[PDB]
Amino acid sequence: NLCPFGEVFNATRFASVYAWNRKRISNCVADYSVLYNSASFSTFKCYGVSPTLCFTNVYADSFVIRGDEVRQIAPGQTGKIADYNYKLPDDFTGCVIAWNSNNLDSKVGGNYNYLYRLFRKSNLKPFERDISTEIYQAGSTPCNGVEGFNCYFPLQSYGFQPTNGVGYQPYRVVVLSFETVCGP
């Protein structure tokens, strides 16, 4: 039975990096050539493996980030997305694939539905997802649920706009992590 990669890649709606989606691909056969030979990808970075196997489980994590932020979807990277949104491990065996989504995820006036965490006290551990909407305490006084000075909402929108520069344009990113699944 073929692996359901189309569902992840051709999904109508992707998710915010803060709440990235994970699809477990198990008990299936997969041709990775079709994906590589699509030619629709800006980034096809594979770490620990060549273009060419067999793995216990395959995970397909998917989200939307800016183009200037795809660099952070790699092992050993630092930044707001890597540190506080999605982290790839230093020991990473897998492939990171990406494409521009301006036509789909950008709206005149801006798309305020894709959010990110700008505020977190600590860097995220690998493959951790924080979906907390708690108000951040940037100072001594406890925030107590009220936004204000030193009391701020941790999640912010990208406001993707079609006139945005490509680096600030939305990119759809699928991370294939290799941990039932074999090539043809």
């Epitope: 006290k121 600590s122 520069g165 600030y168």
Partner: antibody, heavy 116, light 105 residues
Framework: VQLVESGGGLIQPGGSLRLSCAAS????????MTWVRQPPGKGLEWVSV???????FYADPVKGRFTISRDNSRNTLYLQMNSLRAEDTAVYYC???????????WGQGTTVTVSS | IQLTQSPSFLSASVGDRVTITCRAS??????LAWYQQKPKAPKLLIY???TLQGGVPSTFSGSGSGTEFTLTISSLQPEDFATYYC????????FGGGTRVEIKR
Amino acid sequence: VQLVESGGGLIQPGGSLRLSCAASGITVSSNYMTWVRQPPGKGLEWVSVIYSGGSTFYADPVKGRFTISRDNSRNTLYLQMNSLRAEDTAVYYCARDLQVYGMDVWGQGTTVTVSS
Amino acid sequence: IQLTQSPSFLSASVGDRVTITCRASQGISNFLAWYQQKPKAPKLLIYAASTLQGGVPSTFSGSGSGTEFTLTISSLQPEDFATYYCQHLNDYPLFGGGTRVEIKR
């Protein structure tokens, strides 16, 4: 409330100086903390930033020469400037960068002069 | 990646309307801030192109999205005479050349 800067002085090319920013009303560790410089008569330029999680980023001109640091106990931010050059002469400002809400709290400034 | 603040020097009188323009090389949406420096620490006036920081007088306004942004003072007042800087809000912060508002004579 207040960000207080200290440490500026006269130094010669190749020298090292450390600047201090003491904070009240904000927590240096809990916030993105930045260093911005105004070369004399030339306007504002970014130098470095420390993130809440420890990630440090630096401007290409000061990349191998400067280090941003913090002490949570003293609520103090630091910039260690080494291999100093004349072009590094400026008033050095410390700020708290709420990134999408702007750099709201700024320090008074400390002047660094590098001359032979 | 390139921000140009157009009126480097502006001359005006109290009660006048002053418009300062910041242009970006590429579209940056609403990611810009406006700052005032008297000769002493920059002060934040506007964040997100149009949002006033607290305490800033209503005479101060921000407009713009994409490539062109403008700061407008409805009536210049004595303390408003100063230098104004536009900043791009990005992981790598960029400031504009600056605009000096001077008394007309």
